């Protein structure tokens, strides 16, 4: 991230996602259930640090979704979660999950700035396939409700028209600007 | 909820949503910004306790979304959140937000079991407008990816094909079945 504020935002966003979310995905890899690939967070790599915040924001909770071979794998995994009291997960079955697509030239498709195994493409395009990265809130307002957009600084415009904004980074304890304790 | 397990699930789901989520919506009502109606959680009432868990699950995080008059209200509110370091919110602008609709006879439309002010209908139908309530996971599998469904016991099938399941209720400390301390 170029700006300090952007870097702080990214660290904060990442920290908050860790607190929400459920490490149960790890326990699933010891269930013996085959056909579980992992979370999108484990499967997607950002190609360019300039878009790290945009991709974190555009993935949002989808980062914690678990990619699986099919709906049978999902139902088996859900039984395991229930039996072992491991909370909840969202599963993305490769044969069912519907890819989304960009249908405009408003900006840079988010999928262009990530790397992932072609095998899980349906899951990746479901999460990020119609997301476009734009530079600011100004260059976004005309398309609210018609294009999914994320700004470089981390505002999110769902295609539905839902708008998400504000700082990820918290206020924290105040720190004297004066050097009162050298 | 008929079953004890369902009631426990509902309490747990509600408690978990409270911990996630941000009470910043309350601070917004003191910003002087007009055209803010409140969160969907404050605006929707369940008509029948039998569907309380289904509606909690089908709303999910949308329960914390803030309904506003238009995108101008959203952008003003986002500036306020940033200035006062109040974290993030998702806004639903009534003039932009896209209602969803049920296009099948698979089961009971979720909107049929709630009450809400007609004024915010676009926001409510955006969240719940294509959700159908079905009785179990069995009566659901054929339509994975073509109908948004929630089971009475709280599994969620997004129209995309994403499947969410598992207990909301936590294991907790073990409790002797033996009466060892009368």
UniProtKB/Swiss-Prot annotation, chains A, B:
It comes from the Archaea. It is found in: Cytoplasm. Residues 35-141 form the SMC hinge domain. Required for chromosome condensation and partitioning. Binds single-stranded but not double-stranded DNA. Contains large globular domains required for ATP hydrolysis at each terminus and a third globular domain forming a flexible SMC hinge near the middle of the molecule. These domains are separated by coiled-coil structures. The N- and C-terminus interact to make up an ATP-binding cassette-type ATPase domain. The SMC hinge domain mediates dimerization and binds DNA. Homodimer. Belongs to the SMC family. This is Chromosome partition protein Smc. It comes from Pyrococcus furiosus (strain ATCC 43587 / DSM 3638 / JCM 8422 / Vc1). The chain holds residues 488 to 667 of 1177 of the full protein.
